Amino acid sequence: MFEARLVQGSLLKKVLEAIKDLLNEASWDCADSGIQLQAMDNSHVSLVSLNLRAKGFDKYRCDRNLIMGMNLTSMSKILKCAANDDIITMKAQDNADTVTFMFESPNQEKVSDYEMKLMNLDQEHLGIPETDYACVIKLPSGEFARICRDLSQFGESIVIACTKEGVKFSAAGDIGTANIKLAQTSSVDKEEEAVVIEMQEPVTLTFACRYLNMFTKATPLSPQVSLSMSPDVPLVVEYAIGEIGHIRYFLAPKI
């Protein structure tokens, strides 16, 4: 069968939040190193890619191989029934028509068990045409978040411009023009505090806003986030899921 058992249930839930509003139905691929999730959002613009590795679960086990076709909203109700010390455990038979999550408690003895129904899908693994991007920004995830939320009240679009020393976010509305600017981190300190740019040649791109705002759902997962940018190639917002893997959001520029 399949029995992936994470010590810190919270994690999975967080991940649900990071997707939930983007994708309304996903197939979790299970194999010997772990689960992997590939989907193109409701409106087919952004792309989610999720990895979760065997070594990170307290107990991993995929004998055979599973495309689990879980609907995400339903799954979100279920996780939402967990607590934050709750031991999740997805479980499934080989061609299981159902996946079971089963929550235990560390300092209690209630034992939840929710079985949800699995769906069939086609799975369109468009690759991540791997490039070495022109500019890698690392920055505080909650900073990036505060930024994205703020600048949405002006434009529908965000201009992200990096140079060797700083990154700049900019928005123009029928209301006002707005410019937020981060300089780079003197003395490479705590990542909650650290802006660090590896800068080959300057990049300046426009992105849509609702999408940044949804990618920033993933903010709790890591206190850091990392925008990799090159011209004409999509943009990668990458949150580390903290030692178990990570989630990448892919978005195309405009203009």
Numbering used by the authors: 1 to 255
Tell me, in the authors' exact words, what the paper reports.
Proliferating Cell Nuclear Antigen (PCNA) is a member of the sliding clamp family of DNA-replication accessory proteins. In most organisms PCNA is a homotrimer, in which its three subunits adopt a doughnut-shaped structure in a head-to-tail arrangement; this toroidal structure is extremely conserved in protozoa, humans, yeast and plants. The structure of PCNA is comprised by two α+β domains joined by an inter-domain connecting loop (IDCL). The inner face of the toroid has an array of basic residues positioned to provide favorable electrostatic interactions with the DNA-phosphate backbone.
LvPCNA eluted in a complex of approximately 90 kDa, indicating that this protein assembles as a trimer in solution. LvPCNA had the cognate fold comprised by β-α-β5-α-β-β-β-IDCL-β-α-β5-α-β-β-β topology with pseudo symmetry within each monomer. The central hole is highly positive charged as shown in Figure 3 and has a diameter of 30.5 Å, large enough to accommodate the double helical DNA and slide freely on it. A peptide sequence containing the WSSV DNA polymerase PIP box was modeled and docked into the crystallographic structure of shrimp PCNA, which is its natural host. This pocket comes mainly from the IDCL (G127, P129, T131), central loop (S43, H44, V45, L47) and from C-terminus (F250, L251, A252, P253, I255) residues.
